[PDB]
Amino acid sequence: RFLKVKNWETEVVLTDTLHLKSTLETGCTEYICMGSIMHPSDVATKDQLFPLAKEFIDQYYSSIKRFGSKAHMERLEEVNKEIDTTSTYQLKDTELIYGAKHAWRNASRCVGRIQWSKLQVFDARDCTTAHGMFNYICNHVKYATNKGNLRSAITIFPQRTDGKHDFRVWNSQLIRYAGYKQPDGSTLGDPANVQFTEICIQQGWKPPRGRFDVLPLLLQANGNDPELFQIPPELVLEVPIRHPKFEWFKDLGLKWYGLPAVSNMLLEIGGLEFSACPFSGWYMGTEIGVRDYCDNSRYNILEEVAKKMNLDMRKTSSLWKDQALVEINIAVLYSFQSDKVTIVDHHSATESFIKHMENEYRCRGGCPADWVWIVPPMSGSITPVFHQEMLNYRLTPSFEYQPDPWNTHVWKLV
Amino acid sequence: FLKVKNWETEVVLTDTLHLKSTLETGCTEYICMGSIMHPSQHARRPEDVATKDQLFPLAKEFIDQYYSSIKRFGSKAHMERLEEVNKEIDTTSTYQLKDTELIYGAKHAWRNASRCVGRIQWSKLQVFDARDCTTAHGMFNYICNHVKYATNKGNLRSAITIFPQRTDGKHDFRVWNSQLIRYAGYKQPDGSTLGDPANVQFTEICIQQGWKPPRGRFDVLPLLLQANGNDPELFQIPPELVLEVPIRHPKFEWFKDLGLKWYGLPAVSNMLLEIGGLEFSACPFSGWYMGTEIGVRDYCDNSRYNILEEVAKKMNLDMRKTSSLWKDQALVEINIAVLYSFQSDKVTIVDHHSATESFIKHMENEYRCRGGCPADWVWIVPPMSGSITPVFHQEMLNYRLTPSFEYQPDPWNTHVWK
Ligand code: HEM
Numbered sequence: 001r002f003l004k005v006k007n008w009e010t011e012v013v014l015t016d017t018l019h020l021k022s023t024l025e026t027g028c029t030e031y032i033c034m035g036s037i038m039h040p041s042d043v044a045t046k047d048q049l050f051p052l053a054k055e056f057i058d059q060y061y062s063s064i065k066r067f068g069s070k071a072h073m074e075r076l077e078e079v080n081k082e083i084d085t086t087s088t089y090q091l092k093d094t095e096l097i098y099g100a101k102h103a104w105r106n107a108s109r110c111v112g113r114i115q116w117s118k119l120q121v122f123d124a125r126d127c128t129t130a131h132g133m134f135n136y137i138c139n140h141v142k143y144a145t146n147k148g149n150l151r152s153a154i155t156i157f158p159q160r161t162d163g164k165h166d167f168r169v170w171n172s173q174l175i176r177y178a179g180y181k182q183p184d185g186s187t188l189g190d191p192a193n194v195q196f197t198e199i200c201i202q203q204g205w206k207p208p209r210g211r212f213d214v215l216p217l218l219l220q221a222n223g224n225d226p227e228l229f230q231i232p233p234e235l236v237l238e239v240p241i242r243h244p245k246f247e248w249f250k251d252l253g254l255k256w257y258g259l260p261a262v263s264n265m266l267l268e269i270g271g272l273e274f275s276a277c278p279f280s281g282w283y284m285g286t287e288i289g290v291r292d293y294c295d296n297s298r299y300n301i302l303e304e305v306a307k308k309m310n311l312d313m314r315k316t317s318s319l320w321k322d323q324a325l326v327e328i329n330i331a332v333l334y335s336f337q338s339d340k341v342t343i344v345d346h347h348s349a350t351e352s353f354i355k356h357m358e359n360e361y362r363c364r365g366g367c368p369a370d371w372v373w374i375v376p377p378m379s380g381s382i383t384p385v386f387h388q389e390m391l392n393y394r395l396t397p398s399f400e401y402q403p404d405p406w407n408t409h410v411w412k413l414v
Numbered sequence: 415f416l417k418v419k420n421w422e423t424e425v426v427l428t429d430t431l432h433l434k435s436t437l438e439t440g441c442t443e444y445i446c447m448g449s450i451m452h453p454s455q456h457a458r459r460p461e462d463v464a465t466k467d468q469l470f471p472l473a474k475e476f477i478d479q480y481y482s483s484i485k486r487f488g489s490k491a492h493m494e495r496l497e498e499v500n501k502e503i504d505t506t507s508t509y510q511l512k513d514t515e516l517i518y519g520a521k522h523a524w525r526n527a528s529r530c531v532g533r534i535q536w537s538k539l540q541v542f543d544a545r546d547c548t549t550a551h552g553m554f555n556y557i558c559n560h561v562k563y564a565t566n567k568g569n570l571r572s573a574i575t576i577f578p579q580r581t582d583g584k585h586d587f588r589v590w591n592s593q594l595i596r597y598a599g600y601k602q603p604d605g606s607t608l609g610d611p612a613n614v615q616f617t618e619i620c621i622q623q624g625w626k627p628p629r630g631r632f633d634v635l636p637l638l639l640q641a642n643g644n645d646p647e648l649f650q651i652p653p654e655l656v657l658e659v660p661i662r663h664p665k666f667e668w669f670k671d672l673g674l675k676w677y678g679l680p681a682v683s684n685m686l687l688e689i690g691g692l693e694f695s696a697c698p699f700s701g702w703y704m705g706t707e708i709g710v711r712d713y714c715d716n717s718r719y720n721i722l723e724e725v726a727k728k729m730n731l732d733m734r735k736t737s738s739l740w741k742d743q744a745l746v747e748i749n750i751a752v753l754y755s756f757q758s759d760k761v762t763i764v765d766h767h768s769a770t771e772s773f774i775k776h777m778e779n780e781y782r783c784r785g786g787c788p789a790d791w792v793w794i795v796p797p798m799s800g801s802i803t804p805v806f807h808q809e810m811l812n813y814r815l816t817p818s819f820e821y822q823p824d825p826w827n828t829h830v831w832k
């Protein structure tokens with residue numbers, strides 16, 4: 001079978017055969033679509049692991065044009081021995097690199113995947129303690145930041161065993177700003193991080209209580225209680241936000257960090273689960289300018305910017321929010337570019353994604369894509385992805401969500 | 415039961431209405447087709463004149479639903495109605511709706527339209543019964559009355575006009591226009607396009623049918639009307655019935671020199687209304703605009719009027735690189751002008767902030783009284799400034815309830831001319 005997707009702007013039609021490889025569920029049924037549900041739908045047994053491992057080893061040997069080779073058959077035999085004797089198995093370095101790159105390639109919600117094959121993979125599977133994790137993460141940050149010429153990277157800590165010895169980075173990103181609830185109901189800093197900030201403070205962090213305090217790392221090795229570490233400040237690259245035309249914009253006191261580094265997801269490769277796998281790229285400007293700065297639940301700066309713009313805020317139909325939103329996003333891009341910190345605007349990023357998508361259809365037979373996430377949160381229809389039909393399905397290796405660790409960890413101290 | 419969450423407010427709604435869904439969405443548990451324009455060809459009755467065992471179950475389902483809606487399930491009138499529909503199908507292979515059922519069906523087709531952000535208004539719909547029409551001249555009369563009623567000198571009123579249902583598929587009533595009022599598009603000698611590029615093909619059909627085009631940028635197209643399966647006929651809508659808004663900007667005095675205008679009445683005329691197995695192939699309906707339909711899509715789509723270049727030039731923006739966001743900046747100004755112009759001329763219009771807020775309220779109402787509200791996030795979220803509207807943060811479930819509005823093929827792809 002085949003499925004066709006059409007671009008209603010260009011009338012290009014692409015044919016998807018890759019969807020026949022789909023494994024896990026989307027969340028939809030034949031009579032209900034759940035495409036706008038954010039999170040739809042203890043550890044694998046010996047019998048469950050065998051076919052998952054085979055499927056992955058088969059796809060790896062096919063990608064390197066060695067399917068059916070003597071090395072392919074011996075790897076399957078070796079993997080089967082380990083599952084039989086140890087209830088798990090260990091990836092080769094080549095397989096780990098392949099798996100991590102393809103999990104990115106398969107991330108239907110990621111607009112930056114034209115870069116998927118250029119990923120630096122740091123193997124941290126020899127790590128045993130939270131101090132070791134800190135070292136690996138510091139090296140990752142320094143490598144990826146590269147004095148502003150950002151480089152994509154992932155660091156992979158030991159896989160889950162019995163579920164009682166998980167490695168976890170408790171932070172949602174490696175670098176984020178604290179949030180502090182005030183007695184009067186206001187919030188200082190980032191409201192999204194209020195709960196995690198409370199956890200850090202309880203664990204002994206002495207907070208500066210400012211608007212842009214970089215959070216400490218909360219690292220868990222081998223199922224033990226997590227431990228606090230301060231990222232060396234010289235490793236944290238930040239960009240002060242100014243505007244090319246409004247001299248008053250710098251007086252807002254805004255800044256942001258250069259390195260987006262997601263640290264709470266799970267990497268699944270051949271049935272193995274890597275619960276600590278922080279990965280990083282570079283920003284699309286709207287992530288900061290639209291969501292981080294203008295979500296009502298985040299820094300929520302629309303009103304202040306519109307005030308300083310002298311906009312008429314008495315009625316929605318003046319589009320004062322829309323006008324301020326654009327200027328904020330001009331400032332974000334101008335500031336990063338001025339400081340020579342890698343960033344991509346939503347027009348360039350979506351254009352490249354269409355190129356990537358078309359390439360993937362030609363060479364791979366498809367490209368799973370989540371329109372709801374791919375379309376940028378402003379100016380949707382003036383980007384080419386708005387007009388692009390997409391098919392969403394789940395391929396493995398994959399990045400997956402997992403519960404926040406504070407909701408499942410059983411503590412040990414005192 | 416299924417839950418949807420709003421990630422801004424943390425409001426959670428619980429959906430049970432989806433248990434009544436009738437048609438496939440196109441998705442499976444392994445593939446989601448939520449961004450496909452036409453994901454499914456699943457129809458409730460086959461291509462044309464159904465046999466009795468194909469039509470009667472659908473009729474019974476709808477009559478059951480209607481008599482349930484008025485607390486008369488199993489009543490004397492319900493059972494007589496079933497026997498009456500049974501005889502009509504036995505003797506004519508179809509049946510005729512009562513006026514009350516027709517009004518109920520049209521309002522519930524709107525209520526069930528998962529792509530429509532305007533549905534808080536669903537029960538305020540004026541229904542014009544045009545099922546006695548026999549000629550394209552009569553269709554023109556019905557459509558003119560609809561336009562005048564709905565326009566109401568700028569105080570727009572929602573309305574639908576319903577022409578005779580399909581019988582054998584050879585006697586179809588069709589409005590060939592996609593909307594009752596649209597602008598012509600013309601292929602220019604050098605290769606460019608004058609007017610609306612979306613309508614170039616339809617414009618050519620009209621010209622080929624004898625229409626004399628004034629060949630400007632905003633020429634209101636004639637009506638191309640098909641009655642009882644015959645060849646379609648051209649009619650000029652009386653210009654005094656076509657309300658238009660010249661577009662100006664509250665700050666930029668040069669904006670009016672761009673020479674832009676638009677019409678006030680959005681009137682979809684190419685969809686099919688499906689009620690109890692009956693297919694009404696000509697059912698023009700109209701409401702009022704959300705400003706982004708004109709200011710974002712009509713004006714700024716690359717394959718429509720494509721005016722971003724012009725506007726940004728007059729604003730003296732840096733058009734050298736995408737990262738200056740000159741497209742985004744001009745886009746906001748255009749949408750400010752559209753709203754300011756309609757409002758200045760007292761022509762009903764809603765902005766995307768007010769419309770999306772109203773739709774969230776409508777969802778909550780529907781979950782409270784009906785147990786659900788089918789909604790297509792991809793269509794409901796406006797095409798600019800998405801995440802600063804509340805619908806962006808609202809999870810939605812999409813499913814297909816009947817009665818409904820459906821797409822149908824363009825008639826020039828199927829009509830065998832006489
Ligand atoms: C290289 C530059 C990159 C850019 C410009 C980019 C861009 C983006 C954007 C804008 C999002 C949506 C984020 C949000 O709305 O919260 C996203 C999501 C995502 N990115 Fe990429 N990304 C990049 C690199 C990467 C890398 C290196 C990886 C992994 C190795 C990755 C994996 C993901 C995943 C898994 C998601 C979706 C997470 C989910 O399902 O919630 N991205 N990306």
Ligand code: HEM
Pocket residue numbers: 520524527529530531532533535539572573574699700701702703704707764769793819
């Ligand atoms: C009263 C004011 C109304 C407003 C503000 C409104 C708003 C909208 C908007 C913005 C769209 C998306 C249009 C597009 O992107 O092409 C839409 C679609 C739609 N509307 Fe409404 N609408 C209104 C009234 C109505 C009425 C009276 C009906 C039918 C009786 C209706 C039925 C539909 C349908 C079926 C669609 C989907 C069309 C498709 O799938 O192509 N609407 N509406």
Ligand SMILES: CNCc1cc(Cl)cc(-c2cc(C)cc(N)n2)c1
Pocket residue numbers: 260261262279280281282283284287291
């Ligand atoms: C939207 N800001 C927070 C956020 C959330 C998520 Cl789920 C992913 C990313 C993300 C990840 C990578 C590797 C690059 C990039 N540009 N963004 C950022």
Ligand SMILES: CNCc1cc(Cl)cc(-c2cc(C)cc(N)n2)c1
Pocket residue numbers: 680681682699700701702703704707708711
């Ligand atoms: C998007 N502009 C063209 C267009 C296309 C479609 Cl499919 C529907 C509507 C539409 C229909 C009604 C009744 C009200 C309204 N505001 N828009 C307009």
Ligand SMILES: C[C@H](O)[C@H](O)[C@H]1CNc2nc(N)[nH]c(=O)c2N1
Pocket residue numbers: 035036037038372373374421806807808809810
């Ligand atoms: C409810 C809806 O699915 C949710 O708000 C989504 C919409 N699209 C998104 N798209 C991106 N890139 N990031 C997001 O967080 C979201 N949120």
Ligand SMILES: C[C@H](O)[C@H](O)[C@H]1CNc2nc(N)[nH]c(=O)c2N1
Pocket residue numbers: 008386387388389390448449450451792793794
């Ligand atoms: C491919 C995609 O589904 C298509 O471009 C859709 C996106 N969302 C839309 N939303 C509305 N309201 N109207 C549209 O025409 C579209 N087009």
Ligand SMILES: [Zn+2]
Pocket residue numbers: 028032033034035441445446447448
């Ligand atoms: Zn779906």
